[PDB]
Amino acid sequence: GNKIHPIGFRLGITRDWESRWYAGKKQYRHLLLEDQRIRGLLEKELYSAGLARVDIERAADNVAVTVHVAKPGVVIGRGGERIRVLREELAKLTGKNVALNVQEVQNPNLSAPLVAQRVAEQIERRFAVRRAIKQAVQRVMESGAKGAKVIVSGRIGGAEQARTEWAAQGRVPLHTLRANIDYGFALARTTYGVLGVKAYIFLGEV
Template identity: 55%
Template sequence: MGQKVNPIGLRLGINRNWTSRWFPGSQITPSSILEDHKIRKFLKKELYYAGVSEIIIEKAAKKLRVTVVAARPGLIIGKKGADIEKVKETLKKIVQKEVAINIKEVKRPQADAQLAAESVATQLERRVAFRRAMKKVMQAAMKSGAKGIKVKVSGRLAGAEMARTEWYMEGRVPLHTLRAKIDYGFAEAMTTYGIIGVKVWIFKGEVLHKGIQVEKKEEATREERPKTRRGRQ
């Protein structure tokens, strides 16, 4: 089961928290979910250049707080906060509420799964060979302290007539271990041959109930496993 489901959703309440934090009544739940979707879609499009990893939305009765976790926060804020004010005003028009925006920096961008997936997708759109793009991201993640990484691409790879799936893995990625801190990211590359899906799993260590990081004395063995499967998943 751990191989199929979203690893973030599987670990909610264990070592991951929800990215939408609000408690509406049953009648307004659908509209609140749609509102969250619009906020995320707008911010992803507007702040794409800043490398947005995560968007956390917190709602009160008449106020909305949005926390944007990005690799380059300075580009979001702009000179004297001018750019962030423009974003805030646009969000006010979308949600019709008072909006507060917090910006956080990603400590290790190379070990962030969402940023890694978007990096591979960007390289594929620039016609970089998919194997080269995958291995480049994997090497950067392992150098920045990741315990393991798995990258999977699906679609018409290298312009092939039949879609297929290929993946590479280095180190350990224990998807069935619930205490394992697994970061997951997904992105799509819009190529001339069609859409190529990119999925990235990054293992950052095991977390106990008290939040203690378990360090292994022996280093994880490095391995690369090229796999091919015909058809799309």
């Protein structure tokens, strides 16, 4: 066992770094700390809208935050009020005239993080784990997505002993570099402890 991170395995090719910028040794750690703070705040705030990806880049004492969301209306709010207040909050955090951007992920069934968080939400609502997993894999499989796989950790349905569920369908070649596999993790907090949800999606080759 002990599979390594399917993204970290493909950082060079078929994937890209979430944070893209440069800093010397003198001023590296500070930028990273700021970046982590931004990510934390965004995860905390925009969770309702269905966040899937946060991109940060720097040009010259600037921040260009791009948020990939299933539902962009929630983020924008009415008359661009919520986006504006969020921008204000981020700029107050760090005086770097941040430039927030919002993108809508096409076919939100094809993003692994969204699938993972959905399954975690379902588990939090005392659903049936196996049936939910089967349905999720089915929905992923419907709209292309040559491969799909969903794993739920353990402590199923408030049991005493943990166990893994694993429903999958199609081709999921974790051993191939030119795979373009999209991966998503989620944590479901219930009254009987925590559960881990992992989702793998396989979108063609090359």
